[PDB]
Coordinates of N, CA, C and O in Angstrom, one line a residue:
Chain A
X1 N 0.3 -3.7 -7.3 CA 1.0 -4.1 -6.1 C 0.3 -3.4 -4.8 O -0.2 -2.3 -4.9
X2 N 0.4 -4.1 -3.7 CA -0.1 -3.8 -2.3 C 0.6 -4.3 -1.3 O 0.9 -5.4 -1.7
X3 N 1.2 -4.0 0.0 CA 1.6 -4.1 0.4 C 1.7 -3.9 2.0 O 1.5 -2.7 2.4
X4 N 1.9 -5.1 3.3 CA 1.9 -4.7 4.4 C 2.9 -5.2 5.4 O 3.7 -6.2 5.1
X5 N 2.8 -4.8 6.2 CA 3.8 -5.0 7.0 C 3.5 -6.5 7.7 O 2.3 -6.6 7.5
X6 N 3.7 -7.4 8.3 CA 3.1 -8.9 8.3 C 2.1 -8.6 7.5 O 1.3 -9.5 7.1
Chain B
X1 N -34.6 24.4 -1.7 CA -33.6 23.7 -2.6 C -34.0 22.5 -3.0 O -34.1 21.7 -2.1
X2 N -34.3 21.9 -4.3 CA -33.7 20.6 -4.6 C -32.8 20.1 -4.0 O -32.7 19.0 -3.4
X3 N -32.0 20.9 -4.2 CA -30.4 20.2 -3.5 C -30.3 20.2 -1.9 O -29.9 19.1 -1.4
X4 N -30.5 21.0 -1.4 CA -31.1 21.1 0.1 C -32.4 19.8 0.5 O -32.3 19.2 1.6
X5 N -33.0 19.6 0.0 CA -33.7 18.6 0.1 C -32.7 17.5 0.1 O -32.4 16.9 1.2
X6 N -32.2 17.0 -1.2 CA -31.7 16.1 -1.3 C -30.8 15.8 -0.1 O -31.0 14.7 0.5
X7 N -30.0 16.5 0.3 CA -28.5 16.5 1.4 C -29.4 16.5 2.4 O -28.7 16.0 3.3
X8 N -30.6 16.7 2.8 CA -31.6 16.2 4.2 C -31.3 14.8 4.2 O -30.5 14.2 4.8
X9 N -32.6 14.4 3.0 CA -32.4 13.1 3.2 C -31.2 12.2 3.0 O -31.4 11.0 3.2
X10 N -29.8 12.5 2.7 CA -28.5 11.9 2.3 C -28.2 12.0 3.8 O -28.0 10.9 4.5
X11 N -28.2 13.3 4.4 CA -27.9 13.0 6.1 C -28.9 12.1 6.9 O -28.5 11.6 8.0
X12 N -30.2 11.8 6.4 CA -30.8 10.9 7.5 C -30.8 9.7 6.8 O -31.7 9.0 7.3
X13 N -30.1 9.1 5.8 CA -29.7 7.5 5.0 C -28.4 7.3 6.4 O -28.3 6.3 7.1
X14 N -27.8 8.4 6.5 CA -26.6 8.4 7.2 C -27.1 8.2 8.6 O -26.6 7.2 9.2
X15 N -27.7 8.7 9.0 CA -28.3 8.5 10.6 C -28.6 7.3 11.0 O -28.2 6.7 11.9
X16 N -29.4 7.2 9.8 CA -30.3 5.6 9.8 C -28.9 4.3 10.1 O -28.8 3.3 10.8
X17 N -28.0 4.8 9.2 CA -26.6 4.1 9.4 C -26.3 3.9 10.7 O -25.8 2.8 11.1
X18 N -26.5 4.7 11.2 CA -25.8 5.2 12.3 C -26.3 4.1 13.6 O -25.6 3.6 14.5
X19 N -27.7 3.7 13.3 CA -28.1 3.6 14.6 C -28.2 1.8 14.1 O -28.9 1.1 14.8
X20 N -27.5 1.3 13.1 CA -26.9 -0.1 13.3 C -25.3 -0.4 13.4 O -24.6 -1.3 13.8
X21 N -25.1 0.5 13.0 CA -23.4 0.5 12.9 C -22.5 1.7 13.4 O -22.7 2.8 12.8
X22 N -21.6 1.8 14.2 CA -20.5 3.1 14.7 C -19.9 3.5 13.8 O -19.7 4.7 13.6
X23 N -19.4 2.1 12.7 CA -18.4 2.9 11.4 C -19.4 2.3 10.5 O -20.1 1.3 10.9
X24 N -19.4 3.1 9.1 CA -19.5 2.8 8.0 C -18.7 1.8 6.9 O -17.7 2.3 6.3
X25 N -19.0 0.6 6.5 CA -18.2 -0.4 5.4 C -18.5 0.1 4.4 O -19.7 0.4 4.1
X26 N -17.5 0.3 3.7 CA -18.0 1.5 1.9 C -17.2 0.5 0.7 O -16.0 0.5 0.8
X27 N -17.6 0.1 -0.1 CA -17.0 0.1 -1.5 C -17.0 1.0 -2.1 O -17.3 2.0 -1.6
X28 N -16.5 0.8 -3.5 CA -16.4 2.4 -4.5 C -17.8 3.3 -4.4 O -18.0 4.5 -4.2
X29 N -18.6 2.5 -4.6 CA -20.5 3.1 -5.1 C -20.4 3.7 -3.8 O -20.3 4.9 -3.9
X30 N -20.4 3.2 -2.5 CA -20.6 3.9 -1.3 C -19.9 5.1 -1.0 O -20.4 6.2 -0.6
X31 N -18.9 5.0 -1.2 CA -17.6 6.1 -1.1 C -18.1 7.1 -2.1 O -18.4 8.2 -1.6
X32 N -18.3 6.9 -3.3 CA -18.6 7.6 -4.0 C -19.6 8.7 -3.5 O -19.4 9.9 -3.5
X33 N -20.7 8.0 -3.2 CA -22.2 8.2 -2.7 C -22.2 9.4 -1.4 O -22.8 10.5 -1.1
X34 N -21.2 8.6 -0.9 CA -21.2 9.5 0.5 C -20.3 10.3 1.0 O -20.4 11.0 2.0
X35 N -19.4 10.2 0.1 CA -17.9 10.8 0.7 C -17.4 11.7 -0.8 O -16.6 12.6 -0.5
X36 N -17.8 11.6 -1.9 CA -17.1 12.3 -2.7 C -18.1 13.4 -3.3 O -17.9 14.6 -3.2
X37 N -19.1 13.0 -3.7 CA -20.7 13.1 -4.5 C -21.0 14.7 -3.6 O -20.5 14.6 -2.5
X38 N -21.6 15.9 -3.8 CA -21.9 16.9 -3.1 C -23.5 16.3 -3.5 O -23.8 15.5 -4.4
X39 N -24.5 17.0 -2.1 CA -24.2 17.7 -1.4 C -23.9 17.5 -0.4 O -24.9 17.2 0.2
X40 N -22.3 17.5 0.7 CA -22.1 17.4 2.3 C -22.3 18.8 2.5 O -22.2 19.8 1.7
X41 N -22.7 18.4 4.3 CA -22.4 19.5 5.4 C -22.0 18.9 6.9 O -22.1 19.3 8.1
X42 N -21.6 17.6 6.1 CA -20.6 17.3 7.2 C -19.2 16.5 6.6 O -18.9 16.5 5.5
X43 N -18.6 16.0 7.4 CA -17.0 15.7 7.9 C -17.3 13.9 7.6 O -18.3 13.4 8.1
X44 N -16.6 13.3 6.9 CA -16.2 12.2 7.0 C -14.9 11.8 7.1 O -14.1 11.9 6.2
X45 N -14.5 11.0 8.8 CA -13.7 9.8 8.3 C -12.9 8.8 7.8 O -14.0 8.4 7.3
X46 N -12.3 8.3 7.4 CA -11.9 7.5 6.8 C -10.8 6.5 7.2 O -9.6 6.8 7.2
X47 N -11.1 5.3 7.4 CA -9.8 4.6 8.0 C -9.8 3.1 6.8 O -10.6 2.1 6.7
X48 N -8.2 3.7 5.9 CA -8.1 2.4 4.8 C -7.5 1.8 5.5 O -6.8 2.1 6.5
X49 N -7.9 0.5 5.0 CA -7.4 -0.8 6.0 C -7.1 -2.1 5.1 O -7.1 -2.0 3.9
X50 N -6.9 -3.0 5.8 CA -6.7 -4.4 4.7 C -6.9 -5.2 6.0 O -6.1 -4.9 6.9
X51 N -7.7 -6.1 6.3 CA -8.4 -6.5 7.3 C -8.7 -8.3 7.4 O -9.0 -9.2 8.2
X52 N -8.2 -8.2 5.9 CA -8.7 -10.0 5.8 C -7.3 -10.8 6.1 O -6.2 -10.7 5.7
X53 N -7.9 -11.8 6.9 CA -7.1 -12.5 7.7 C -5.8 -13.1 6.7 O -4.6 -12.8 6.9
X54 N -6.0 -13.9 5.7 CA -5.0 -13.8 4.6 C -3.7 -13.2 4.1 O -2.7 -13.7 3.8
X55 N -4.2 -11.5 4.3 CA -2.7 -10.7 4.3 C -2.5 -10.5 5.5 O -1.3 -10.1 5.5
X56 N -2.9 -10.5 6.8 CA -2.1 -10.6 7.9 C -1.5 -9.1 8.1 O -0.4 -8.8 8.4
X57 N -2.3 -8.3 8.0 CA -1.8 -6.7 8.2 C -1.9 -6.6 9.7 O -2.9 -6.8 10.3
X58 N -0.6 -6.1 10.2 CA -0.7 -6.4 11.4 C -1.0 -4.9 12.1 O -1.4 -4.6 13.2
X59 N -0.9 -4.2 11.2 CA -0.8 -2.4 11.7 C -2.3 -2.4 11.4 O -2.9 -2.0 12.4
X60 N -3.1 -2.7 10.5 CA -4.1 -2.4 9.7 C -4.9 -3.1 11.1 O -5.7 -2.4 11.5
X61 N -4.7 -4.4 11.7 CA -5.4 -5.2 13.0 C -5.5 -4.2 14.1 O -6.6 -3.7 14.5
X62 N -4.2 -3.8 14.5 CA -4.2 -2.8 15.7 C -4.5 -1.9 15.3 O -5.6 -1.7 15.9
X63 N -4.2 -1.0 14.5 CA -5.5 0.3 14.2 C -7.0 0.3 14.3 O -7.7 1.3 14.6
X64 N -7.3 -0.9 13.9 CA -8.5 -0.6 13.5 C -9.4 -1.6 14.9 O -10.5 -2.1 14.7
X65 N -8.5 -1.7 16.4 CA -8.9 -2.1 17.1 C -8.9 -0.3 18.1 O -9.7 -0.1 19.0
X66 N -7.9 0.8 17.7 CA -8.4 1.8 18.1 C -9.0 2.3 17.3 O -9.4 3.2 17.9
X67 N -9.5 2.4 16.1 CA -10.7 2.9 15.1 C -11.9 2.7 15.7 O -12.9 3.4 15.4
X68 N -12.0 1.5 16.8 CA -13.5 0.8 17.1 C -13.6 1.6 18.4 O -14.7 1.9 19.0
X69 N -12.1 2.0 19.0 CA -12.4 2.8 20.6 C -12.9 3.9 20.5 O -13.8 4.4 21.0
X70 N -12.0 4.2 19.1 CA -12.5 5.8 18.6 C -14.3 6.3 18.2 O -15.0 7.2 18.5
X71 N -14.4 5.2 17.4 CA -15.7 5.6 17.2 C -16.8 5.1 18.1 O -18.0 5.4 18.0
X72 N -16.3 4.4 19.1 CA -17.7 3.9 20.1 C -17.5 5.1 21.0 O -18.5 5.3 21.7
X73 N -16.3 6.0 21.3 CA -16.7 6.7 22.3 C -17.4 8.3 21.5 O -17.9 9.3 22.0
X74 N -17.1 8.1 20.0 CA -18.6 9.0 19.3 C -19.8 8.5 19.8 O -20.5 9.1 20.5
X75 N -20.1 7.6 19.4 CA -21.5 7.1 19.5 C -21.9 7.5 21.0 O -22.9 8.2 21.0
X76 N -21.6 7.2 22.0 CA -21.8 7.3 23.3 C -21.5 9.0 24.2 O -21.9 9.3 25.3
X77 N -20.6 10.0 23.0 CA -20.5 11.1 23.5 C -21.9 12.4 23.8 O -23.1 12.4 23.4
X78 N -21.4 13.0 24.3 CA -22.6 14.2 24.3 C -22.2 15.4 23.4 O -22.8 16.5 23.5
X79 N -21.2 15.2 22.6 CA -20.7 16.0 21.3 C -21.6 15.1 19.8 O -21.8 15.6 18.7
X80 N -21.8 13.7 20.1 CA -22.4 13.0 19.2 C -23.4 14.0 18.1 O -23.9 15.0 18.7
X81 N -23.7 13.8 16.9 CA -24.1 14.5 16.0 C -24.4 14.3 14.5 O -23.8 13.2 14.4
X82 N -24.8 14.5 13.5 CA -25.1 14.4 12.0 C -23.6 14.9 11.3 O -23.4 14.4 10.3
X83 N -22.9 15.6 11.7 CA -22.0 16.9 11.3 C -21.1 16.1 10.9 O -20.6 16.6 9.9
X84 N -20.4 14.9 11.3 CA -19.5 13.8 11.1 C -19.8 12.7 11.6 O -20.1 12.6 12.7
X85 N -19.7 11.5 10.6 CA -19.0 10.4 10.4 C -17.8 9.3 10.2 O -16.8 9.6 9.6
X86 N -17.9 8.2 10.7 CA -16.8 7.1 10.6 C -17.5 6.3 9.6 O -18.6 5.8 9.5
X87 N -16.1 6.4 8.5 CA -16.2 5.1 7.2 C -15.0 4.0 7.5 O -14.1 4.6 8.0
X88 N -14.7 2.8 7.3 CA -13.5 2.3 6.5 C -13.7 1.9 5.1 O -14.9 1.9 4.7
X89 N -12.6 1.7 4.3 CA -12.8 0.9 3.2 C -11.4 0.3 3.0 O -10.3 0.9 3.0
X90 N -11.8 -1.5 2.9 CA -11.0 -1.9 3.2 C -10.4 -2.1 1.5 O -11.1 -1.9 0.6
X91 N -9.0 -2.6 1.2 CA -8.8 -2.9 -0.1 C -9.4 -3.8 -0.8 O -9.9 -3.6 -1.9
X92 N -9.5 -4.8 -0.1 CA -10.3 -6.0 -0.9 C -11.5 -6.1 -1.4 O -12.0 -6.9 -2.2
X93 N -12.2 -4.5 -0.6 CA -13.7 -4.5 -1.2 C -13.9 -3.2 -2.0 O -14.8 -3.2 -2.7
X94 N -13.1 -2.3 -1.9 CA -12.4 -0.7 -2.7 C -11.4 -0.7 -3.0 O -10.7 0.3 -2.6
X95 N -10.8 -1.9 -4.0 CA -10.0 -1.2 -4.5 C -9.6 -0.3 -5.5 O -8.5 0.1 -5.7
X96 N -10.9 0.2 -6.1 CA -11.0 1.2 -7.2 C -10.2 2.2 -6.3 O -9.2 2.9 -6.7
X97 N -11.0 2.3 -4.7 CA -10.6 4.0 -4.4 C -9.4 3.7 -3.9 O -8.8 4.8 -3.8
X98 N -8.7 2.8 -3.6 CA -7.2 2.8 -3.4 C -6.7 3.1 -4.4 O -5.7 3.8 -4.4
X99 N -7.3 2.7 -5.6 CA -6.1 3.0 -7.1 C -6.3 4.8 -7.0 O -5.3 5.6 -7.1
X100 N -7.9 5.3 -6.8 CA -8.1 6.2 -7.1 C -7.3 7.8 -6.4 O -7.3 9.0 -6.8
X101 N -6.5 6.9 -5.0 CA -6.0 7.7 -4.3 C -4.8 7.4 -4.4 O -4.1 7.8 -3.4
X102 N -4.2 6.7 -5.3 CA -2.8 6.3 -5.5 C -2.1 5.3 -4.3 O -0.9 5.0 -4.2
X103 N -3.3 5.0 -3.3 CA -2.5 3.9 -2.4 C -2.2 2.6 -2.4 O -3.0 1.9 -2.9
X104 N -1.2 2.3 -2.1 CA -0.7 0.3 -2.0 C -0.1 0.0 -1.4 O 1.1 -0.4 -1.6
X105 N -0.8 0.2 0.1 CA -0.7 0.0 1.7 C -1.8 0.5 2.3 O -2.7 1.1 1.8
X106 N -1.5 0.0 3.5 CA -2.8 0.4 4.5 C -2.1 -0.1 6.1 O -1.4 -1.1 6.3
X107 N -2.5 0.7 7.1 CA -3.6 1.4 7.2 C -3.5 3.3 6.9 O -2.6 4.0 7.2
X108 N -4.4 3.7 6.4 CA -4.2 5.5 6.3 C -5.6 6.0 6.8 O -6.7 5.9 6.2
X109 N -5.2 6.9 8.2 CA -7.0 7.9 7.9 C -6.7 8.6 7.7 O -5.5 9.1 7.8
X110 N -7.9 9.4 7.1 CA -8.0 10.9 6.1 C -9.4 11.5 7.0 O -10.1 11.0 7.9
X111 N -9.4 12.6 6.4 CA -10.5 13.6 7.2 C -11.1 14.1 5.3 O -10.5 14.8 4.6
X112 N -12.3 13.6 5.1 CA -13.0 14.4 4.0 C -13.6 15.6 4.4 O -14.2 15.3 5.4
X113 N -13.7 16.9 4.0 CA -14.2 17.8 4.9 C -15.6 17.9 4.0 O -15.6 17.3 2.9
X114 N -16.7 18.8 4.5 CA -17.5 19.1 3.3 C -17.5 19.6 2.8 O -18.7 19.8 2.4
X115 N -16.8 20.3 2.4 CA -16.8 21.5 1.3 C -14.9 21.2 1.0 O -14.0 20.9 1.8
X116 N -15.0 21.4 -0.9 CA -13.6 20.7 -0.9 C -13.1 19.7 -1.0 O -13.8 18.8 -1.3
X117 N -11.4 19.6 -0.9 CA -11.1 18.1 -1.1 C -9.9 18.5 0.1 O -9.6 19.6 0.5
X118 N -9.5 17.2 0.7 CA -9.0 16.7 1.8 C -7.6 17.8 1.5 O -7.0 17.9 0.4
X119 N -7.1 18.8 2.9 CA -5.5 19.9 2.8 C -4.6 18.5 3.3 O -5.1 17.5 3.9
X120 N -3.4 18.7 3.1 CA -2.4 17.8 3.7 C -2.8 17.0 5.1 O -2.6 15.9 5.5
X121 N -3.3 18.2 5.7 CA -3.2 17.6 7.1 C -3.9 16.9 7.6 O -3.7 16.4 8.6
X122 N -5.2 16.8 6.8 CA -6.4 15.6 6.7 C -6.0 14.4 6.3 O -6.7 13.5 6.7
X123 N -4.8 14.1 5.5 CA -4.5 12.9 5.8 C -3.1 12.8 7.4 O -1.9 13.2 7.5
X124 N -4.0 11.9 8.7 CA -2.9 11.6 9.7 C -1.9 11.0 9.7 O -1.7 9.9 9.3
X125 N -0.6 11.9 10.5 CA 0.6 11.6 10.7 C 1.0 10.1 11.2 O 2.0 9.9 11.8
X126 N 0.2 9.2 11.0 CA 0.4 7.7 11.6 C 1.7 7.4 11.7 O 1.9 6.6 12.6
X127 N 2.8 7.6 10.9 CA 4.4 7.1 11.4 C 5.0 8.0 11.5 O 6.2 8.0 11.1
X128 N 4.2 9.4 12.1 CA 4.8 10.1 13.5 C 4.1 9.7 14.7 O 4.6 9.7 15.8
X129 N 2.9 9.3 14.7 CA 2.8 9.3 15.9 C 1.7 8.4 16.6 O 1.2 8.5 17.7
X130 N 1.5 7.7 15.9 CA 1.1 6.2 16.2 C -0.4 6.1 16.1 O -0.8 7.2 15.7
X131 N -1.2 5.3 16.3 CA -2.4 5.3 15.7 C -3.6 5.1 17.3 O -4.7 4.6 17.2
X132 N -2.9 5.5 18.6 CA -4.2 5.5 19.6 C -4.7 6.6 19.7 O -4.4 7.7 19.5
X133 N -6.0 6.0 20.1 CA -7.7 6.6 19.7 C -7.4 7.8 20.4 O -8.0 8.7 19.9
X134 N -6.5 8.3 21.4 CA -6.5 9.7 21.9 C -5.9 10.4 20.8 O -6.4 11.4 20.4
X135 N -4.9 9.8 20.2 CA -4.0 10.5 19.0 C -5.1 10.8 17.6 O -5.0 11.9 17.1
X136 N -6.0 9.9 17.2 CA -6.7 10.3 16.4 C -7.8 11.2 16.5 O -8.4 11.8 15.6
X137 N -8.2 11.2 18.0 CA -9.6 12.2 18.6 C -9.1 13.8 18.4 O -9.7 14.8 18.1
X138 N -7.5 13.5 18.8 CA -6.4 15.0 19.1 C -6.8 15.5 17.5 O -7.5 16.6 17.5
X139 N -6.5 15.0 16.5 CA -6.4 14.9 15.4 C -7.6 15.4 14.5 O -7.6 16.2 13.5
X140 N -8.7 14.8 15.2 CA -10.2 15.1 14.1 C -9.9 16.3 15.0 O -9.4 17.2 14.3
X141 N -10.2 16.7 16.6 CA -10.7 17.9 16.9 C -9.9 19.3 16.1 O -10.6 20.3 15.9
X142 N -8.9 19.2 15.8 CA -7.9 20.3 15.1 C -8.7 20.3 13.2 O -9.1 21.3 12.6
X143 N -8.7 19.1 13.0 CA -9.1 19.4 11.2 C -11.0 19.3 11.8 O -11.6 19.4 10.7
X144 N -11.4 19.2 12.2 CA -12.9 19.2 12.1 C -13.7 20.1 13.3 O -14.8 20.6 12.9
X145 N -13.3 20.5 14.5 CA -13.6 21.0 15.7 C -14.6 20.4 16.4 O -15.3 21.1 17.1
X146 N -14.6 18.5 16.3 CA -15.2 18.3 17.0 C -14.4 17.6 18.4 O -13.2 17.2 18.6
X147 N -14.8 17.7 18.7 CA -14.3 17.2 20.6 C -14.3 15.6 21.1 O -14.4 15.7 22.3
X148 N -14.2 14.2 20.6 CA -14.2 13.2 21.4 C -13.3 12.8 22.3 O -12.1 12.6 22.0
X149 N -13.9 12.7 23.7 CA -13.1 12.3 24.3 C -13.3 11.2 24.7 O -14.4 10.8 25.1
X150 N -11.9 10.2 24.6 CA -12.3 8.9 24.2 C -12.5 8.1 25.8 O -11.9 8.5 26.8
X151 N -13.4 6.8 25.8 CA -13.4 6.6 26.4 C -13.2 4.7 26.8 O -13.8 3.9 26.1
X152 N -12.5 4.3 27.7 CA -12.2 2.6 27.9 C -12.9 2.2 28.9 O -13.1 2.7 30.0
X153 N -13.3 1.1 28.3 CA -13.6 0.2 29.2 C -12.7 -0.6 31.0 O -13.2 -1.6 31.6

């Protein structure tokens, strides 16, 4: 998993 | 030294860098090479990022549009020097060293020092205190002692 903010 | 030899030439591969590019692009091999691998006797940078238009990182965009202030007003300083460097690595092209540092997000900079591994405060307070190029210059000068003062267009 990775993840961003927009 | 063998090893003194070698860390000559490892700092002038670095120079040579230097004088096509402000920051360094690193995958694992590179990071490895240059940032983890002894022998340093200088300071590296580091701004993780995720950059490709696809995921739409919107922190990871604006940071790394002060990452570019930050490091062009190195390049152009009269503190400029061998002693430290600017890397990014973005996920899509390292993701080994994201696994390797337990990250799954971005953006984060870190201060690699040379000698050692990075104290708490080498990695920056970004959601205290936001990510402009004065706020990161404040930042390297305290963990590194060098001085940029940044400069706009």
């Amino acid at each position: 998993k990775f993840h961003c903010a927009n | 030294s063998k090893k003194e030899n070698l860390l000559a030439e490892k700092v002038e591969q670095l120079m040579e860098w230097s004088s096509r590019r402000s920051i360094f692009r690193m995958n694992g091999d590179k990071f490895r090479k240059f940032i983890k691998a002894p022998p340093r006797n200088y300071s590296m940078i580091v701004m993780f990022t995720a950059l490709q238009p696809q995921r739409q990182c919107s922190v990871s965009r604006q940071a790394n549009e002060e990452y570019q202030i930050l490091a062009n007003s190195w390049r152009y300083s009269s503190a400029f020097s061998n002693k430290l460097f600017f890397s990014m690595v973005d996920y899509d092209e390292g993701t080994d060293v994201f696994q390797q540092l337990n990250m799954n997000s971005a953006p984060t900079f870190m201060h690699f020092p040379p000698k050692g591994r990075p104290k708490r405060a080498d990695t920056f307070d970004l959601q205290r205190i936001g990510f402009a190029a004065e706020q990161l210059a404040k930042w390297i000068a305290d963990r590194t002692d060098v001085h940029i003062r940044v400069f706009r267009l």
